[PDB]
Structures are given as structure tokens and as C-alpha cells.
A paper describes a structure:
[name]-[name]-2 uses the receptor binding domain ([name]) of spike (S) protein to recognize its host receptor [name] 2 ([name]) and mediate cell entry. We measured the binding affinities of rabbit and hare [name] 2 ([name]) with receptor-binding domains (RBDs) from [name]-[name], [name]-[name]-2, and its variants and found that rabbit and hare [name] had broad variant tropism, with significantly enhanced affinities to Omicron BA.4/5 and its subsequent-emerged sub-variants (>10 fold). To elucidate the molecular basis of rabbit [name] binding to [name]-[name], [name]-[name]-2 PT and Omicron BA.4/5 S proteins, we solved the cryo-EM structures of rabbit [name] in complex with S proteins of [name]-[name], [name]-[name]-2 PT, and [name]-[name]-2 Omicron BA.4/5. Q34, a unique residue of rabbit [name] compared to other [name] orthologs, plays an important role in [name] recognition.
To elucidate the structural basis in rabbit [name] interacting with [name]-[name]-2 PT and the molecular mechanism of its enhanced binding affinities with Omicron BA.4/5 [name], we solved the cryo-EM structures of rabbit [name] in complex with PT S and Omicron BA.4/5 S. The local refinement of the [name]/[name] interface of PT S/rabbit [name] and Omicron BA.4/5 S/rabbit [name] complexes harvested 2.75 Å and 3.14 Å molecular models, respectively. In Patch 1 of PT [name]/rabbit [name], Y83 of rabbit [name] forms a H-bond with N487 of the PT [name], whereas in Patch 2, Q34, D38, Y41, and K353 form a H-bond network with Y449, Y453, Q493, G496, Q498, T500, and G502. Q34, as a unique residue of rabbit [name], plays an important role in [name] recognition, forming two H-bonds with Q493 and Y453 of PT [name], respectively. Yet, in rabbit [name], the hydrophilic T82 sabotages the hydrophobic patch, resulting in F486 being shifted away. The longer side chain of the human E30 residue forms a salt bridge with K417, whereas the D30 of rabbit [name] forms no H-bond with other residues. More residues of PT [name] are involved in the recognition of human [name] than rabbit [name], where A475, S477, E484, F486, and S494 only interact with human [name] but not with rabbit [name].
Residue numbers in the entry:
A (entry chain A): 19 to 132, 141 to 614
B (entry chain B): 335 to 528
The structure:
Amino acid sequence: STIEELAKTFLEKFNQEAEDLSYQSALASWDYNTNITEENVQKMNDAEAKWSAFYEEQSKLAKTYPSQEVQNLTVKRQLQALQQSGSSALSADKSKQLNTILSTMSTIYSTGKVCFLLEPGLDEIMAKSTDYNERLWAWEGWRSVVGKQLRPLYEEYVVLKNEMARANNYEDYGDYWRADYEAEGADGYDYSRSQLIDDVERTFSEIKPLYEQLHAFVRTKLMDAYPSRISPTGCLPAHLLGDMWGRFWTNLYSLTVPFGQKPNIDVTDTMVNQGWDAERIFKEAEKFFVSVGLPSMTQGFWENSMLTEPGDGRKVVCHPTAWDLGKGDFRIKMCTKVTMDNFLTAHHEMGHIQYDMAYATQPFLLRNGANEGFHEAVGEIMSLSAATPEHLKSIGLLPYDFHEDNETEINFLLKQALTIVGTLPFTYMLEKWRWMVFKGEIPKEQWMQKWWEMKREIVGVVEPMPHDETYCDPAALFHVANDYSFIRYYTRTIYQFQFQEALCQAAQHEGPLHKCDISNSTEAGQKLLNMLRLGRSEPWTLALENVVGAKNMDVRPLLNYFEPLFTWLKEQNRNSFVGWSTEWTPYA
Amino acid sequence: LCPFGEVFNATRFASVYAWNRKRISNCVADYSVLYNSASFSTFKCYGVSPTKLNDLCFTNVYADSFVIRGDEVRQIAPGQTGKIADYNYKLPDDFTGCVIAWNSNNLDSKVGGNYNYLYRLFRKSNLKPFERDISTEIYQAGSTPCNGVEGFNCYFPLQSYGFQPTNGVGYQPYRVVVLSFELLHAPATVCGPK
Ligand SMILES: *[C@@H]1O[C@H](CO)[C@@H](O)[C@H](O)[C@H]1NC(C)=O
Ligand SMILES: [Zn+2]
């Protein structure tokens, strides 16, 4: 009659039924994502509907066992994971309204027009064109056709979601999104949600000295791109950042390059001449993993996976993904070619499947990552290690006599920094703004004002036109129009370099960290696997402590990775001013 | 010559809980066709050497046949515990016999999914060695007695295996035959040639 025994007995039946229904749904979805017809969608819809109905009914039944009385931690975590899932229910009348609002907010984003549609043409015009007027035209037009048509919808969305958040014992919706990082366990392994808003901020205080230098180096480089249109001591204009939003600065490499007379490493021509194929890339990727102490891929992977576009007239989307269908079924789907970026993406997806295979022995409800940010941080370090000159020289794509001149490291580090460092303040600012909006710190009538004040104070980007309260700029982003979390990227960026530092120190390497390689090293593989096999059965603090040796986020490895770039940059900024002042406007 | 082909290559097998039991006596058995079959996965023999199984001989040989999953094969061994090793089929510690298992994915898998193989996952007490149970009474978990219908804290005691062709290795069907030897006071009747 003990509650723990009843919970155990209930979960024993639940696992067995779920392991079949989920597999059927996953196979039905794979059928659609592989072959696109008019009959596969019906089967996919039926399978997904049945799975959702079963999950909701079981979640409703599983709320009679209190989570406080159960003492065993594994059973308690399984019950907590089952009860909260499917608990998003307050009333049918308001649920219908919320669903309709979400659908109509999602559909307007896709079919927007300026007549140029976003994805084919606007992205290209934002990423290639070098004219002031055209870029400002596109920026203002896109923020006028979609932004001005979403303010009331989002104003209703915030209050309707806050009601649902309050009804479910949480404080607000921000507290709901921050519940993924809650950890309960031993004395030193407890992490509270309200702590995260502090920790993130602390880490950013260490990244400001680096990013600021970069903000100067880019600015003095745009001086030549446009003669007399940007300030020599103020913030950068918004539309000249390489994208529609400024999320990534990767498109500014051509203008902002230290030495343009030395081309970077390219192996596509050698790969074509040596006579490689799509399967050879995956064979080499598997050989990379078998040499560190991780299992080789299964027989069914080769027989069932799609590794090239089929020419039999079928239609495939073939966006590179890795699937874990359950019951020992692991597949990778990708349109493969004979370039280098596909070679790196192969390692990324291979790392995903290795992580999936690590915790296949855990119970059903605990077969996920420790937190939302580990699962891609595991896959990025593999590409970082497999894109190095030493690995390519070993594998034969480069001659042995080839050397690495200092300019090559400087250029490669600048290219990496324009992608990794530049995207952190944007994410931090957007997440902070939505958290404050949800909580209620910012009244309903001062949204855009505070948004641009934060943009001028944190990121350092100024608007070209005056925006009143009618407009709504944050809603233009895809991750906001369709509701999604955004702090995952900020966590992943720190985790991927902390893991890399730990593994490289364990792999007995000397010198700068960006020339590391974990090939032919079983100790690093064992250290990584000790965490990969843990799964979600333990709090993420212990999982992090099993690789690095700490309990929280540390930013020192990220700053160590960019030390040569920092030292070089400090030399070229002596005859310039570092920083910005928020009193200058392009329109006045 | 008693027909080992009657059980080894039979068209249909039995479930774990209703496992098939066969008695073999008054014949000659040539084990050289089995150990050197070169088409088996596991051939673990306990209490008797595999090569010395052609000289010393017993009176009665009992063959137990069923089908199980892939990762549950390790549970058919002396002293092991689990879910099918304590509720469905149990082996005593002092076991003198052999366990043979092999893959059968080509036969016991369907594109839609086989579902006619059953096993037990709820019981009041562990099975005594060499015992079977085929009762279909509703398992009683909570204090409230449930009669004829299963509801809260009451469940049916049998479930089915979801065998499908595109599974892994530890989820594919495996056919298992266990041979047990008896050496009672009765005179010997069965063993190999001269
Ligand atoms: C059952 O069939 C197999 C399959 O060829 C064959 O070896 C023989 O007839 C039987 N097996 C044994 C071990 O005798
Ligand atoms: Zn990935």
C-alpha cells in the first residue's frame, strides 16, 4: 500500500505501452519526411493523434501520487516528468483562443510580402548587397509589413499565457521557461530557478572586455565600406550587420579581414581529385569515433539510413537531421555532397547519434540530455576537433610538408569569433527583455523605448529611424513569432568550450587550445562517456562535474580560446577609441 | 535416433510463460551435429563438458522451448534475476544441462508487427524452480479488491512483444532451447554411438 510501490507498478506498465506507441509514431513521421505524398500525411496525423491522446490520458491519471511523499529519487523524477507534461490545461474556451492566436501569429510570418518574399530574396539582399539605401529599404519594409500587424496579437498573447502560467502553480511564464534548470539532489547539487537570472549576468561581465574590442575593430573597418555615414565614436547602425536582425556577423568577413592575400584551407578540390564518395565521409567519421573509445555504429544504420538524394523521382526535404526512433533504431538523414561543410556536418550528426546511443539503457522518461544545452554542445566539439590541420594531414587530405603561418591562425580565429562571440549579447538582451515583459517590470506602454535603450546600452546598435509604440520589432524574429526558448544557445556556447578545455587537458596536449585534437586518445573518450551514459537520471550539476570538475558555468575556457586574437587586437586598437556613447543618432 | 529436428526446426514455438516441455528417452543422440552446427549464437553448457557429452550418458533428457527477446538471454542462467527469470522461467542452481539460443528475425517479424507472443510482468511471489503459471487472474495491487474489471491499481498480468523487422539487435526475437539431464536410479537408455 506504500505509495512508492504503487508508483513503481504504474510506471512499469507505462514504459511498456509507451515504447510501442512512440515507435509507431516515429516510424510514421519518418515515412513522411523521407517520401512526400498525399497519403503519408494522413497516417502521420493518425499516429500522432493517438500518441498525444494516450499521453494526455496517462498524465491525467498520474497526478494522484504526490511527489512529496515518494522518497526514491528516480521514481520521483519520473513522476515529476510525467505530471508536468500534458498539464497545460486551464479551460477549453481559453485554450481554443490561445491555439487560434498562436496559429494566426505563425501563419502571418510565413506568408509575409514586401513583391519579394523573405526566405529566397530578402535573406540574399541582406547578406550580399553593399548599398545603404537598399538595405535600409528592406529593413524598414520588413519591420513595417509584419511588425505593425502583430502588436495587438502579442499583447493578447502575453496576458493569455501569463494566466496559464499562474494557474499551474508557477509565478509567471518566465519561471515556466526557467524550470528546465531546476536540480534537486544532495547538499551541493541543488540549483534553483531564481538563481539562473543572476548567474548568466555574472558571466556576461567577463565577456564585455573582449567583445568591446571586436566592436571597435569592426567599426573602424566599416569606415572604408561607407565613407561618411557612420559615427567614429558611436554605435553601429542596425541594418549594416550582415543579417536582417544582427544575430550573426559571419557575412562581414569579406570587409573585415586582416590579410586578404592568403586564402584559407579548402580541401574540396583534393576531395574531388582523390575520388571520394558520400559513404567515404561517413566511414572516416566513424573511424574518428572508434579511435577514442566509443562504439561503432550498428548494422541497421547502414541499411536503413538515407545518405544521398534519391533520383527515382521522389521528393525529399533532406534537411540534415539525426533520428533516434527507439527500440535500437538510429538513423541519419542528409543530402550529402563532396564538400567540406558536409564533412563537418557528418561529424556533428555522428556525435548526436553517439549521445543518443549512450543512454539507451535508462528508463523511457529519462532518455534526454541533462539539460537543453548539452545535446548540441556534445556535437559541436567533434567538428571543432575534426576541422583542424593536424587531423587533415593525418587523414591524407593535406601534404605532410604543409605548415601553418601566423596569419592563418589570425584569420581562422577572426572567422570563428564573428560567429561565436558576436551572437551572445543579442541572445542575452532578447531573453532579458522577454523575461521582464512577462514578469511585468516594463508597463504595456513603454515596450519599444526600453527595447532600444537596452540595445544601445548592452549590444551597441542604434536604430536608423524613429520607432513609436505602434511598431513591434522583437516579434519579427522567428523564435518569437513561434514560441520557443532562446537561452539554450547562451548556455551551449559556454559548455562547448568548457568541455573542450577539460578534454584537451586530459588528452595531454601542449600549446594553444585551438590546435587541439582528441584523436587516438582513449582517456578523453572514457571521460566523455562517463557523462554521456548518465542521461537525465541525475541532476545536470553532477553530469557537468563528471567531465570538467566544477558545478556551474565558467567562462575562463572561452576567453582562453581567443587569447591570441585578443593580444593581436589590442595592438591594432591603440590609435582608436574603444567603447561607445549613447547620445548619437543616425537621423539626428 | 530421437528427432531433435522435431523441436529445433519446428514451424511454431510457444510463449515464455506457456513454454513447451518435451521428454526424450530410448534413443541415440549425436551431439556433434549441434555443437559444430556453426549457426548458433550461444551454446552455454553447465555441469558437463561440451566435448565429453558423447561418452557419459543419462536416462531422460528434458527439452524446454520458447522465444524471448535479445537482451534477456543472459537471464537464463543459474543464480540470475530479473523480470522473465523470476516470473516466467526459473532455473535451479544445481543445473546440469545446456542452453542454446539463436536469432530468428526472418521468421518471427512482420512489417505490421507481430503481437501474438506474450510474457508475464506481475506476480505475487517468485516462481519455484521448474514451474509454470498460465492463470489469467487480475493482479491485485491496492487495498480495494477489483472484481472482473481492471481500473485504478489493477492490471492484466500478461503483455505482448512488439517484434518488427527494423529493430536493433537487443530487441529482435531469439529462439531458446534448454536441455536438462536426469540421472535417477532408473537404468540408462540414451547416448551416442560405439
Ligand atoms: C532442423 O533443420 C535444420 C535446418 O537445415 C537442419 O540442420 C536439420 O534438419 C534440423 N536441425 C538439426 C540440428 O538437426
Ligand atoms: Zn546538431
